[PDB]
Design a protein around this nucleic acid. Structure first.
Lengths: 173, 302, 246, 302
DNA sequence: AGGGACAAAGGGCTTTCCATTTATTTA
DNA sequence: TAAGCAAAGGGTTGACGAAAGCCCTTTGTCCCT
């Protein structure tokens, strides 16, 4: 693990639980919110042109950190400060508002500008929960186009694409 | 060699019989054809099964279709046309190389005898089957390009030799051995008597709606065209222990008796046709069978 | 004295179905509750609550894959990269026939409210959609539940939306109960340090994440309470229901 | 060096045949057009595969869709509209220097004999694919822009020269060589014999009860539009060992025979284009093949 | 008084890194 | 009311790539003779 984490910090080195990369690939906005991360929550991963080194079985950094709270046992801190501090040096905040939706909300006596950006856990728990447990009403999408590995490593890993729900009500006869 | 028949090889019909309609005429008044209609009558029978004998004390009711002659008419008419269309050796699907060596292996088949037996079933009346029984005298009239030939009742099984069958058979042999087509507008006439029950082909019901659904065409009783085609091709007397003529089949199948006459003992189609294309010479009776089944049709591909 | 104004059988065309990366199809209740603020700011009529059904709805695409137009080349930095088709990121669109109910207080004759919402329909867009045909609006007055049932019987036929609430979390509830989630509120994450890239340059801007809820599609002739079907602004940066959870 | 087709080069249809309809008429009177309809009958034949010789005594049964001329009429009428559209070379999809270098290298083709073979295929009635057989005489009438012509006999395999196809060939050759469209409303009359069998186009059935379902518009027998447009363009006589006029395709491929007549010998359309855009001299009888495939359609990929 | 250097800032082109389930399936 | 409801042959291909790196050019900024 140490050599490819060192390769990651020598690379671009960004981990995130929230992004706008899924809305448009020209996003480059990245924030790791802290209080929403629970034991089964999942996190995606970006480095430039989705590069990396395998762990001698074709295994990159993602399923490593994703597999059953692997990240948690370094985040809670039972693996020592030596790995935990180098992990914490990667989760930085990167701000960008270009080519993103920018909407308003009525707050108390006034309006507030805010940018909707996507969630990390929702896509991966969607691919692993509407699929395995027999929900038979969904749309399968692939982002991006013929080269989907431009966004993230989550984008890179599965090429079947994520799943949304159908929002089609039954209609009047 | 080993030209294995094309994965999909199929031969089209070279005999096109029509849906044989049934009519009611008189023996002297042969022109006033009363159209026999399929009626619907309900039937209170009994359970007759060779198991669980305790159900016989309780009856049962099913609704059938029936076709009866009108009481003022004592003869039934069967109208159909049979179109003998040539080029029996070119397939429809497949049809390439395998069929060409079949063509150059079958230029000496006795098409005269084939045409004679193919029109003998009309000359008698294999088509009728059940309408043939209980008939005082069958009379079939064949019209072909301004040449009307009346026949009586040729004994079905044994193929007798005469002159009036042979002229139409010469026309059919001139059609099947070359190019073109011929048409026989064929009318069967049988004295079944006043009102006796006649037997069209029977269609297919749903799960439970009718016990016996006769083949109706605008409410008129009619025979199936493939039933007529079974009748025309009932010529096969070349299997082992040849007792009675059956329909020419690739396996020699008689489904009503449940016996495979030619299957599994080299006398099926796919062995002596593969031998024909591989270069093994045939007799005068197997090659005429193989071209007769080419006139029959089907698919020949594994 | 409350007043109801009704937009019936409005044909929306070009409406982008991507409510989120996980919910696609109908736009969220933030859209149809911000329509009220849109007519509160553009026109001036105060809208306090909103409810919506669906006469018809269809998302553009096939049975398991709905998808997106060939993108344009409307970016700087792609000078020689224009002969190729596009960079295509997913943005599915839809088309639907809708019914809309707005809670307004007018204190004036009803012959001005109809025209004042009519000229606002012709200039606004319904979540990127284009209005093709819409019925003439009419003003309804209800003071109790008995006269609110007169509002209930006149939207026949439509399929209205009521809140249903989450049990524990999203996809689990979507599985065992087989219901439908959609976005009902937004959670502030981080404040952008510079406002030179904003569209307003004065109001502070925060990044947001979509919070979801479960709903129910109900026949409008079989709903007990319309206030269970109305939606309005909530706290903080959320929407809710007058009638609560159904 | 080389010019290549654009990754995307799509060529739209320059023939738009409508899906033909099958009606029943008499021979002497053609005004009482009564729809030949798709009826659902059931056959009870034999289990006869090339393999499985054990299953040769158990009868199979499927429901098939059949269409016949009714037993009061003796002529099949086939009605369709064919729109020969122009703007042949303009690439619908794609279209730069492989659409325009093709224009400057393909403006001197023979559109006249192209249109003659297409109007001959309609006029000789090769558009029926099975109803030619068992027909005494065919009468194909073509109406273009308020003028009507009648065709009796044309041997279809050899494209003969006459005077009543040739002026329609001038109209169609003028409408492909420039802009616009020409509409041929065509009616085919076939005296098939009294009450004979017609053959509509079968649909694909994906795991259905019907083993044979014909094409259907409003309960009535019909043939596929792409089957008609297949049989307009059976004009290809410029391949290896030139023989039958087969349908024109980029590999000269008939899928019934399972052999492509223009593939793998440097004769295919694709090949016969990269030299043309590169500037090699195309001969007189294969640039017409290229133009016939321009007016067929297809994708011209990378 | 103005061309020439000093260097930032756009801009065209050039790799690149991928490997999971390919969904099944409709009310 | 009872007994039996076929086989092969194929099921398309083409576009749909952001960010780091590497050179090339241009024009803010400054210079004396």
């Amino acid at each position: 693990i140490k050599e490819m984490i060192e390769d990651f910090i020598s690379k671009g080195g960004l981990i995130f639980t929230h992004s706008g990369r899924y809305t448009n690939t020209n996003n480059s906005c990245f924030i790791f919110n802290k209080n929403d991360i629970g034991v089964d929550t999942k996190v995606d991963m970006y480095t430039p042109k989705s590069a990396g080194i395998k762990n001698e079985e074709g295994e990159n950094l993602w399923q490593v950190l994703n597999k059953a709270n692997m990240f948690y046992r370094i985040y809670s801190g039972e693996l020592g400060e030596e790995l935990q501090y180098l992990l914490k040096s990667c989760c930085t905040a990167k701000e960008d508002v270009t080519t993103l939706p920018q909407i308003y909300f009525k707050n108390g006596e006034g309006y507030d500008i805010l940018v909707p950006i996507g969630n990390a856990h929702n896509l991966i728990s969607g691919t692993e929960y509407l699929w395995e447990h027999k929900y038979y009403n969904t749309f399968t999408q692939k982002l991006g186009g013929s080269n989907p590995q431009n966004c993230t490593h989550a984008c890179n890993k599965m090429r079947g694409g994520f799943k949304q729900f159908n929002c089609t009500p039954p209609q009047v006869e | 060699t080993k030209l294995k028949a094309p994965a999909v090889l199929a031969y089209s019909r070279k005999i096109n019989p029509t849906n044989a309609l049934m009519f009611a005429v008189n023996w002297s008044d042969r022109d006033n054809t009363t159209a026999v209609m399929v009626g619907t009558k309900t039937v209170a029978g009994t359970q007759s099964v060779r198991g669980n004998p305790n159900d016989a004390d309780k009856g049962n009711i099913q609704t059938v279709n029936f076709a009866n002659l009108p009481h003022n008419k004592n003869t039934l008419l069967v109208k159909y046309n049979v179109k003998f269309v040539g080029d029996v050796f070119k397939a429809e699907l497949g049809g390439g190389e395998y069929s060409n060596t079949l063509q150059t292996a079958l230029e000496n088949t006795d098409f005269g005898t084939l045409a004679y037996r193919y029109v003998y079933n009309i000359a008698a009346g294999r088509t009728l089957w059940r309408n043939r029984v209980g008939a005082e005298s069958i009379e079939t009239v064949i019209t072909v390009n301004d040449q009307t030939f009346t026949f009586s009742d040729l004994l079905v099984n044994e193929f007798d030799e005469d002159v009036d069958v042979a002229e139409i058979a010469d026309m059919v042999a001139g059609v099947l051995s070359g190019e073109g087509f011929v048409t026989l507008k064929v009318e069967h006439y049988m004295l079944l008597g006043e009102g006796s029950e006649v037997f069209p082909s029977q269609e297919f019901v749903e799960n439970s709606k009718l016990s016996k659904q006769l083949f109706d065409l605008n409410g008129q009783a009619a025979m199936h065209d493939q039933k007529i085609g079974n009748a025309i091709r009932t010529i096969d007397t070349w299997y082992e222990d040849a007792t009675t003529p059956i329909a020419v089949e690739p396996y020699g199948s008689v489904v009503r008796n449940g016996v495979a006459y030619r299957a599994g003992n080299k006398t099926d189609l796919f062995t002596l046709m593969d031998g024909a294309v591989n270069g093994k010479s045939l007799t005068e009776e197997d090659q005429m069978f193989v071209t007769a089944n080419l006139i029959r049709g089907g698919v020949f591909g594994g | 004295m409350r007043k109801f104004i009704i937009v019936k059988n409005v044909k929306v065309d070009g409406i982008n179905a991507k409510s989120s990366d996980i919910t696609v199809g109908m736009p969220p209740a933030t859209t149809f509750c911000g329509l009220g603020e849109t007519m509160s700011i553009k026109t001036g009529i105060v809208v306090k609550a909103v409810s919506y059904g669906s006469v018809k709805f269809e998302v553009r695409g096939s049975r398991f894959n709905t998808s997106v137009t060939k993108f344009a080349w409307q970016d700087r930095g792609n000078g020689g990269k224009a002969n190729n088709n596009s960079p295509i990121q997913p943005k599915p669109l839809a088309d639907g026939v809708f019914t809309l109910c707005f809670e307004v207080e007018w204190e004036d004759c009803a012959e001005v409210l109809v025209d004042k919402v009519t000229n606002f329909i012709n200039t606004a867009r319904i979540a990127g959609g284009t209005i093709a045909s819409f019925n003439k609006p009419f003003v309804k007055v209800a003071k109790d539940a008995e006269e609110l049932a007169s509002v209930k019987n006149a939207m026949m036929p439509c399929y209205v939306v009521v809140d249903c609430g989450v049990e524990v979390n999203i996809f689990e509830d979507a599985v065992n109960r087989k219901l439908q989630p959609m976005v009902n509120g937004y959670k502030k994450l981080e404040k952008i340090v510079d406002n030179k890239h904003m569209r307003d340059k004065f109001t502070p801007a925060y990044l947001a994440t979509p919070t979801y809820t479960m709903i129910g599609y109900k026949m409008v002739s079989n709903v007990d309470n319309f206030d269970q079907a109305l939606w309005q602004y909530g706290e903080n940066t959320k929407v809710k229901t007058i009638g609560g959870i159904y």
